[PDB]
Design a protein around this ligand. Sequence first.
Ligand SMILES: CCCCCCCC/C=C/CCCCCCCC(=O)SCCNC(=O)CCNC(=O)[C@H](O)C(C)(C)COP(=O)(O)OP(=O)(O)OC[C@H]1O[C@@H](n2cnc3c(N)ncnc32)[C@H](O)[C@@H]1OP(=O)(O)O
Ligand SMILES: CCCCCCCC/C=C/CCCCCCCC(=O)SCCNC(=O)CCNC(=O)[C@H](O)C(C)(C)COP(=O)(O)OP(=O)(O)OC[C@H]1O[C@@H](n2cnc3c(N)ncnc32)[C@H](O)[C@@H]1OP(=O)(O)O
Ligand SMILES: CCCCCCCC/C=C\CCCCCCCC(=O)SCCNC(=O)CCNC(=O)[C@H](O)C(C)(C)COP(=O)(O)OP(=O)(O)OC[C@H]1O[C@@H](n2cnc3c(N)ncnc32)[C@H](O)[C@@H]1OP(=O)(O)O
Ligand SMILES: CCCCCCCC/C=C\CCCCCCCC(=O)SCCNC(=O)CCNC(=O)[C@H](O)C(C)(C)COP(=O)(O)OP(=O)(O)OC[C@H]1O[C@@H](n2cnc3c(N)ncnc32)[C@H](O)[C@@H]1OP(=O)(O)O
Lengths: 408, 407, 407, 408
Amino acid sequence: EQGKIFIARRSLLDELLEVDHIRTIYHMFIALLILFILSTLVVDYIDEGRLVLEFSLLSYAFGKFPTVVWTWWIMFLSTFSVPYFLFQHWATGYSKSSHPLIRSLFHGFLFMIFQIGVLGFGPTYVVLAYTLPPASRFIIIFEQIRFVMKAHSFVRENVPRVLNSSTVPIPTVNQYLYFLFAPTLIYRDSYPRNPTVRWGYVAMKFAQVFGCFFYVYYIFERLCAPLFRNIKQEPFSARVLVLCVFNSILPGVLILFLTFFAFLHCWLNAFAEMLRFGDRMFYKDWWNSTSYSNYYRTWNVVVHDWLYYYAYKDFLWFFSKRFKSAAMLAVFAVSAVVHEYALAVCLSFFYPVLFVLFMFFGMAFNFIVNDSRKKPIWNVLMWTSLFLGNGVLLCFYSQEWYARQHCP
Amino acid sequence: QGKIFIARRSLLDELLEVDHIRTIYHMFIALLILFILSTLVVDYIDEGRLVLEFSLLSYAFGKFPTVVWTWWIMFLSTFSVPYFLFQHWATGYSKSSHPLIRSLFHGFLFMIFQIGVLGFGPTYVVLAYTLPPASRFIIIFEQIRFVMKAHSFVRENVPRVLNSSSTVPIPTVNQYLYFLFAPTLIYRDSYPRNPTVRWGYVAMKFAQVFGCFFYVYYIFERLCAPLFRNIKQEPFSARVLVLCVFNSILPGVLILFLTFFAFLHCWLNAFAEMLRFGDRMFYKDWWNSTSYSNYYRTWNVVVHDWLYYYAYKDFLWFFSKRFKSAAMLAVFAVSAVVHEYALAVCLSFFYPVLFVLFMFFGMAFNFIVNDSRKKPIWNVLMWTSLFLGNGVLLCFYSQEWYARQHC
Amino acid sequence: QGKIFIARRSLLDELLEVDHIRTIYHMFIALLILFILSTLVVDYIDEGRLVLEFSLLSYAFGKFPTVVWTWWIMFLSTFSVPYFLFQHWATGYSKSSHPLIRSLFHGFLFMIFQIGVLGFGPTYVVLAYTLPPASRFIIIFEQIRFVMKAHSFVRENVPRVLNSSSTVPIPTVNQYLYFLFAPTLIYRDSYPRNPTVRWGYVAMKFAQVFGCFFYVYYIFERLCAPLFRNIKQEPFSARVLVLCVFNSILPGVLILFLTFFAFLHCWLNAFAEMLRFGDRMFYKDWWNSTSYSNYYRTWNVVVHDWLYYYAYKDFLWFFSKRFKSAAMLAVFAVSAVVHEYALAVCLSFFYPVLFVLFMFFGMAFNFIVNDSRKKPIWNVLMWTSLFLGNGVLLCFYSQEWYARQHC
Amino acid sequence: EQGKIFIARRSLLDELLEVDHIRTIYHMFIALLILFILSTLVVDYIDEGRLVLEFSLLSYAFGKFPTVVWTWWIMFLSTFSVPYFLFQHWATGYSKSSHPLIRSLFHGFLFMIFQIGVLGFGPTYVVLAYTLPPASRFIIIFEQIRFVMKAHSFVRENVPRVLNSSTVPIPTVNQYLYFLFAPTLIYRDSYPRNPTVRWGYVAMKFAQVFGCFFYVYYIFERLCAPLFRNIKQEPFSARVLVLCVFNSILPGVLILFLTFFAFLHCWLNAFAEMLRFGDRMFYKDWWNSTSYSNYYRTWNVVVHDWLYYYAYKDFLWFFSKRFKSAAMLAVFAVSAVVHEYALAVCLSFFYPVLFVLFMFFGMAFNFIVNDSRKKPIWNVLMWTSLFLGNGVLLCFYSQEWYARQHCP
Ligand SMILES: CCCCCCCC/C=C/CCCCCCCC(=O)SCCNC(=O)CCNC(=O)[C@H](O)C(C)(C)COP(=O)(O)OP(=O)(O)OC[C@H]1O[C@@H](n2cnc3c(N)ncnc32)[C@H](O)[C@@H]1OP(=O)(O)O
Ligand SMILES: CCCCCCCC/C=C/CCCCCCCC(=O)SCCNC(=O)CCNC(=O)[C@H](O)C(C)(C)COP(=O)(O)OP(=O)(O)OC[C@H]1O[C@@H](n2cnc3c(N)ncnc32)[C@H](O)[C@@H]1OP(=O)(O)O
Ligand SMILES: CCCCCCCC/C=C\CCCCCCCC(=O)SCCNC(=O)CCNC(=O)[C@H](O)C(C)(C)COP(=O)(O)OP(=O)(O)OC[C@H]1O[C@@H](n2cnc3c(N)ncnc32)[C@H](O)[C@@H]1OP(=O)(O)O
Ligand SMILES: CCCCCCCC/C=C\CCCCCCCC(=O)SCCNC(=O)CCNC(=O)[C@H](O)C(C)(C)COP(=O)(O)OP(=O)(O)OC[C@H]1O[C@@H](n2cnc3c(N)ncnc32)[C@H](O)[C@@H]1OP(=O)(O)O
């Protein structure tokens, strides 16, 4: 059935991390992390005297922070106010008059131009006018996509209701405000209250997300930054970009793992705890996934859920009756266009082949493990090829952005 | 009393096919192969040719034909003379003039065998040619194995015939040969028979032992041979010893895990598969262990079996069980002396305190994690202390070897 | 058609316990031990210390670790790839697109194995290091053994599956391993099982092989090494070659008898005893043989088995049986080529006429004693001609080697 | 029962030498003999040019041959005539008168003094007066012992007959003459005639005995003679007599084997064939023997038969009833005294410990193989000790004769 429920709970990691053997693997992992930190520290201190811990990169990336604070505030207030009261005025007087669609088309057009202009351009304008640095630029683009999807959902959950006729009204501002912070992207008025906020627990999760971000940042500064200088100096057509596409694979793996952990688990669980959300199914065991059709285990449930429900459904609805292939290619096209837009405006670089090559590689992997081929040789090969290929194309992307799209 | 076989599949096979752990495992193998491939193609581009040439291996293995002929001697000697002596002791018991003179003389002859043929033969042939400390390890390994199997083949049958009618059973040699190759150190005839030997399976396990030995070799050389030479040359001032302890951690734990795997799981399973042994209880889940007194979980059970059953029980029988703590101290002492002998003879260096400090460290760790603290903070601290302690103590050991004995 | 096992106890054991022959045997052993003791105590008094120091042995054995690793390679390779290839050929027969393309490709792969891995691998590894002509002998021995066992393991099963329902039987490998160690060269599963292995008996047989090898060594060195050096130095003029042929007779026949014993009786029985093989038909009574055409009595049957059953039968199948003589000539040719290859490669000398002249000599001897002459005069003349002929031809061979190739 | 019969036939070697495997061993043995001869010949000819074949030793040993011819002729005629006609006159008039033993004692004393003087001294006198060389001296002593035993047998076979009373007379001279050449030492008048004399067969046997004697002689000259020179020069107390007591063992074995073969087989079988004797059991398979008591397999049947029947029987008769040990020691003493006499008069040397030490060694061997010890280790040890010990004591005998009983 179509909808959203609250069965799964906690997460998908807190379920395991108290299974004895997995728990001890987890603790060994933490121990190796902390000993790697202490090793780098007290092996580049006694040898260079400085104990560097360079805080250069983020001090430039975060860039103009008060501007993103101010624009995020006005954007939150816009998304919190204008769609709410707009729909409020909308539904209350739906079929008192205007037996044709005139009222509908007109006000829906007002809403559409609101979204596209104010919520599409306003952020894009304030991010391309001041030539924002990517990190803060990424914050703005990210929150703008978030608010676009949340507004589309708040108006997708309630317009088929009022029209089927009593006439369901808009909900309380005291619940809309909450939905604007809920760890989800499907509007519901029904959210289960966990018993109590555990202030110690949310403090621990905030500590974990901040420590995870700082460890990500430190590993970056120490291992991915010097690579970036040495692809900074001579980037055009050296055959020694190979030297580092064979030298950032492992910290690329580490960054992937820790950014997933931090953002998809600690951040979301801490906000859930401060709000007592209840579901906490923010990710699936993506590593076990095998194929796209009917069996995909997304690594991000919120985005996959919104995507499926609000694009694929209505696309099979409108397009045709048996052209599933058309509708699936359509949801691929939607995801591709929005991802390319995000990454392009975020990295001042129009290079649209990244996502589509990602999907070709996903076809490759899924195929080489979806011929009923459980044989571990093929799983190991899939994993090596995943790591290697994502590193390869990451560095080719960084190269093309840095050399051929920098120099004439 | 008595050890009797039940279980199977070690722990790793059963544990792995749990899907999450199986994918963790495949990720680990992918990271290993990518690590070695990347390391290779990074130093083919920054140095020239391949930087792995198998240098230290040939110096380690050394006098191999010596070890093959001494292994045939030791094996043949263990196969015949403890067995022949025992079969001679066997038939004529309880017909003597004096009840025990036959025993005194006969057990004297057997002790002579132990201390001379297996106690001196191998150690003499290893200290004559001053063998390279790897093949020297092979020989001392085999020597303690054969000494323990002989002590077991006698302790498993002598008390049988002695108590009394046809009370004197003595087992066929055709079983003794099998036990000389069994994956255990308690003599038995009670070994079951998996339906077959799976040649594809032993092919895989032997390929796997070969690959893991090769890989530990690669890692060890490239990642701590330079550190070894540095701790050799200038070993006195604290700077380089700190620099070494704080860089001998990650490949340290890596080679530890890989050698534990390749030897306690893969090698033993290849052989037990070839001999259809059944009880593949070769290691308990070391990583979850708690403390010493009760419910200890050893990381290899065969030596733990022998130690418990053939030292603790018997020092109980020697001292009334009110001074059990005293009896317990001696098994500590036996384990200490045997390990100190092994390590010294294999490393031409008499440094006693290694094992006793390792035991004090294990005691401190058990104090950290036990008492049902179970707090992840204490467990993480225990793991960091284990890794770092193994590092620092290996390095202080290799220092006292490189410095204050070469100097 | 088909060889099937019946008999036992070679010939020597049964023949010996006839009392007269048993006492002849004990007299022989007494003369051997008295000969070596006397020889020793005569040259301890006329020279000083013991004159036996094992000089030429170490030069003969030479590159042993090379031969152990190439033996493991050859053994493993023979164990797996003929077997694996065959099991692959097995399951899918009679499902092909073209009836025989699968065969053409598959048999090509197997021929590739034979000629390259077993036809070149061992010969390449023997001619690379220019191995000493004793270990080189070990390797060529093992190589021809494994080639013949592979040809047999294929000729014993391919014609089975081919003729046609479940007509395709393919035997377990756990049997293939046993046949790779059996004392024969016709693959079978039909091997019986004497009740047990008799460890005292194999102890005796291995002590006996060791002693007989030692003794052939002693005799060979002391009695024809000086003659070897003399035929080396001045080999051209007839004087020393006459002097050598007329002194290479008695230790010649002695080492011949002793090596025949130690290898065809003792070694094979030790192994067949270890593997409980049963049919100990390892040699027919060579000394009573009569002629070639019919009722020939070979001195080792295993090679004779292979030769007859896998060359003569098949050249019958190639040429209609009216030119059987022509078919018979080819098995002569196959035996000649294989022996010439063995001897040349093992002795770095291409002298073809050795085997064909030995065959002409055997023909002349059979003409001497056969035709039911049976007169003791002709039999004695045959034996003198055999002993003397073996002597003279060995010496002309060693001359053409020492002289016209070193010169 | 006591007596002599004609069951066994041929010999004990002709029985085997047509068993296939033993036959081929025999032919290999002959081949090794002839090839050893050709080797010595054409390896000391091309190397020394002489092809020596020294005929020195026998030309001195045989010595005064016409004297032994003449004395053997007169001795044969004596043994052929005087005991015959003496007993003839004896028995014919036994109990016609002389009811007491006077006739008996008197004529028996005449016979006894005949034997001791004429047949004991006459040969001993003609061999010690001309100081005969051992070889011919050996012929004379040998034939004298032979004739003594034959006369004692001819008078032992017929005196208990005439006295038990008709009165059995002496036999025909035409049969006595035959008995004086029969290959035996127990007088019988009953000898089976084989069908025919095989002149080719007796020619072959004479060829075999002459070739055997010449091969014995050649091996002696070549291998035992140089040893004899090197114990000739410095014989007193060297410790290098050991060098050759460890260097004549094998040709001592060969001489033993070939002298046994030749004399006990070819000589006796050829004379049997020229006389068609019938028994031809001239030796037992002595190598298998194990002990003296009840189980001895003598290597010489004629002498063992005479010894037993004509010494042991009458010694148990006269001595006592249950003192078998006494009677056995008595036959040992008789054999010892006669053997020591023979060897002493033959080698101009009184050294009586040889035979008794032989018998102690025989005790040793028989004991170490008569404890039900079939184990081949003990049989091999017995054979090695037999060869070694007989060589040892042979050379100690030759030493003592040559050095301490030559020099003052
Ligand atoms: C740690 C990750 C490392 C990754 C490394 C690279 C690996 C390769 C992959 C790389 C991905 C890109 C990564 C970029 C990251 C950027 C950064 C961000 O944070 S952006 C977020 C990015 N995440 C996406 O964009 C999701 C990617 N995938 C998708 O967009 C969709 O999930 C997609 C297109 C794969 C979904 O496909 P469906 O909806 O189109 O198609 P259907 O399953 O195949 O077909 C319809 C059938 O499925 C049934 N179905 C679907 N869901 C069902 C359900 N829940 N229950 C029952 N039936 C269901 C339907 O009922 C129908 O079957 P009936 O006809 O009914 O039999
Ligand atoms: C190739 C040879 C190499 C030899 C190398 C050295 C080896 C060691 C030996 C070296 C010997 C010496 C060599 C010298 C050579 C010189 C040169 C020459 O040509 S000279 C001739 C020399 N040959 C002798 O002189 C014979 C040596 N032996 C003897 O003289 C006797 O044969 C002797 C003393 C051993 C015979 O002993 P019994 O007659 O004394 O004694 P009994 O068997 O032991 O006891 C009586 C019991 O045996 C029964 N008995 C005897 N014969 C029997 C039979 N045929 N059938 C049934 N019962 C029989 C009797 O009935 C009685 O037993 P109831 O009381 O009846 O139960
Ligand atoms: C990958 C490895 C990681 C390395 C990192 C090192 C960190 C430090 C840790 C360690 C590494 C050491 C490195 C050395 C290398 C060696 C190489 C080898 O292959 S050797 C293997 C182990 N090495 C030993 O040295 C043996 C272990 N040493 C021990 O301490 C013994 O195992 C010991 C002393 C603990 C044996 O046990 P107890 O002496 O503590 O026993 P009681 O105190 O008598 O307690 C027994 C009680 O338990 C009951 N019990 C019943 N069933 C039991 C059972 N199955 N096991 C134990 N107890 C049982 C009995 O009924 C009894 O109770 P009631 O008090 O008498 O009433
Ligand atoms: C200690 C040794 C002494 C050395 C001294 C040397 C002196 C000289 C003598 C030789 C030493 C050589 C030194 C070389 C070293 C080699 C090393 C080894 O390990 S190899 C071993 C032998 N060495 C060979 O070279 C193989 C023997 N060589 C041969 O000649 C073959 O054995 C050969 C050719 C004789 C095979 O037999 P066919 O070819 O003569 O057979 P057909 O003429 O076809 O007669 C077969 C007839 O017999 C019937 N038959 C029935 N059952 C039979 C059976 N069991 N055996 C044989 N024939 C049988 C059949 O039905 C057929 O009759 P139907 O004419 O077709 O009607």
